[PDB]
């Protein structure tokens, strides 16, 4: 992706992932635990739904046309059959391109929301944590359950561990 | 401690097209392309089957088409090896004739 | 005998595309030439 | 047997709060989504509100934007709808209904797929506001 | 933030008949609309969704139709027991809006 998180510095997807898209990963004095993000997950969703809402369940009514299979009648038959092939070469053209614009654009996209996820964290951070490169961030305080669950619901007051943090990141 | 960031993977993946590449995997994709047909002109509609009859045969009658001679529908189907004529012959302008036939209604 | 009407028989009308007959009478998907064609509805996979 | 059942309601003066409960039994495995549709005797229908997953939804209608604030406990498989800043307007019969949506959308089970149709009705809980 | 609006407010129609409705909406809407026949006395109950995908178990003679505006719904044989009112939704804006009502009479 354009972003370089998906297939970039994230080094691959979790299998083990099955109730969200994205979400947090951590190791800290209680444990090592998995939690999906819903906002983000659903982020992804709803701009791939309004996609399929474009593409799904919207075709056209036509009714009486002209004859398309034929005896040998020249001129006519000619311009009938040749309108037919330039309109059927026109559509397989704009299916092909919707299709290869539209999976470029969803690959994209995808790959943003993972970018603002990623983002949005550090900037929660504060001065607390140090971007390891690999989507990984090392929290330089003792961060328990709790702790971990206020990163991931927005509710981490940095301010609370920033002497503790700073402490250990600045040192010999 | 730490905390990483990521997003999810599948085993069975499925290779797509777009702009920059020929062939991508991507966790799920959906078939925009209908290929099949379930062979019936649909339920709610009149429908004959002349099987082993040919078409053209409805109008002149062979031992075949014996059934069909006077047949009402609204959907007619063709099948592969049907014979319009138990005496070998053959129609002038004979597929232009049955494009008249398949759209009558019956006879 | 248990809206989009072929030559070879009805066609389903959820896809946008069709491959089974430029013939067509009803609500029905536009024929191409393609026999398949793939819209991601995931993101790119990354295994390993 | 997908039939829920709503509790609560009554009579609450202007400005107080009440929550409605919506206890979702049945072939709802409640990982679809569910909403919430109120309607005055005398007058239509009107949508309120929608739950989705975990925390989705978030969807709640400009005539409560700010006053109407929905809940799900999963655990005990009942829907819930916090009426705070009841105005006399909010007299309603509450209906607490099921959402269904294409296969072809929600793609994750648990989240909000955005375009739902109500299928089973509940029963209706009946709240008046006055003085 | 999306009005609908039913035309008429109540019809008046003889058993047997056919009661064709309206659900004349602003600004485009097609993926998603539902019907409904909420009797006096009862919770509404589900008949068409979509637009012409009518509900599980329910009768034949409930048709739907529309695109974008203009929506339709025409109760086929018509039933002493039709004396409910019909309302319709839509997609989407985030926020699900319900039509007027429609009042549907059986002397």
């Known amino acids: 992706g354009i972003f370089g998180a998906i297939a970039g510095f994230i080094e691959n997807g979790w299998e083990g992932m099955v109730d969200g898209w994205y979400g947090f990963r951590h190791q800290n004095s209680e444990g090592r635990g998995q939690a999906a993000d819903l906002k983000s997950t659903q982020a992804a969703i709803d701009q791939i739904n309004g996609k399929l809402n474009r593409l799904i369940g919207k075709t056209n009514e036509k009714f009486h046309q002209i004859e398309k299979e034929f005896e040998v009648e020249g001129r006519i038959q000619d311009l009938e059959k040749y309108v037919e092939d330039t309109k059927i070469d026109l559509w397989s053209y704009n299916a092909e391109l919707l299709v290869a614009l539209e999976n470029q654009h969803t690959i994209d996209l995808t790959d943003s929301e993972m970018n603002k996820l990623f983002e949005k964290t550090k900037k929660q951070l504060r001065e607390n944590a140090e971007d390891m490169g690999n989507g990984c961030f090392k929290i330089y305080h003792k961060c328990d359950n709790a702790c971990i669950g206020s990163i991931r619901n927005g509710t981490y007051d940095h301010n609370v561990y920033r002497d503790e943090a700073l402490n250990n990141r600045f040192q010999i | 401690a730490t905390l990483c960031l990521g997003h999810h993977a599948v085993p069975n993946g499925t290779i797509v097209k777009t702009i920059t590449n020929d062939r991508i995997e991507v966790t799920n994709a959906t078939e925009l392309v209908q290929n099949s047909s379930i062979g019936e002109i649909c339920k709610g509609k009149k429908a004959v089957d002349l099987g082993s009859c040919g078409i053209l045969g409805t109008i002149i009658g062979p031992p075949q088409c014996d059934l069909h001679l006077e047949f009402k529908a609204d959907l007619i189907i063709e099948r592969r090896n049907s014979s319009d004529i138990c005496y070998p012959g053959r129609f002038t302008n004979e597929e232009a004739l049955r494009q008249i036939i398949r759209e009558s209604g019956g006879i | 005998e248990s809206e989009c009407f072929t030559p070879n028989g009805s066609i389903p009308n959820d896809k946008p595309f069709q491959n089974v007959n430029r013939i067509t009478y009803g609500a029905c998907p536009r024929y191409v030439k393609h026999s398949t064609l793939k819209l991601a509805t995931g993101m790119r996979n990354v295994p390993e | 047997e997908v039939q829920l059942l709503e509790s609560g309601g009554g009579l609450v003066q202007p400005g107080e709060s009440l929550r409605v409960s919506c206890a979702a039994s049945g072939f709802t495995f409640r990982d679809s989504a569910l909403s919430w549709v109120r309607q005055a005797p005398g007058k239509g229908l009107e949508w309120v509100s929608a739950?989705?997953?975990?925390?989705?939804?978030?969807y709640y209608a400009d005539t409560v934007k700010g006053r109407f604030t929905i809940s799900r406990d999963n655990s005990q498989t009942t829907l819930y709808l916090q009426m705070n800043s009841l105005r006399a307007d909010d007299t309603a019969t509450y209906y607490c209904a099921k959402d269904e949506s294409p296969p072809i959308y929600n793609l994750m089970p648990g989240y909000y797929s955005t375009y739902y149709y109500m299928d089973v009705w509940g029963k209706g809980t009946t709240v008046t506001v006055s003085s | 933030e999306i009005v609908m609006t039913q035309s008429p407010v109540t019809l008046s129609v003889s058993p047997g008949e056919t009661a064709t409705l309206s659900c004349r909406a602003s600004q485009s809407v097609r993926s998603n609309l539902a019907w409904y026949q909420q009797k006096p006395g009862q919770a509404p109950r589900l008949l068409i969704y979509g637009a012409s995908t009518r509900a599980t178990d329910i009768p034949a003679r409930f048709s739907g139709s529309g695109s974008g505006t203009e929506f339709t719904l025409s109760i086929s044989s018509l039933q002493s027991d039709d004396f409910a009112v019909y309302y319709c939704?839509?997609?989407?804006?985030?926020?699900?809006?319900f039509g007027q009502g429609t009042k549907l009479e059986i002397r």
């Open positions: 939704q839509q997609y989407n804006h985030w926020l699900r809006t």
């Open positions: 739950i989705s997953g975990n925390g989705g939804a978030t």
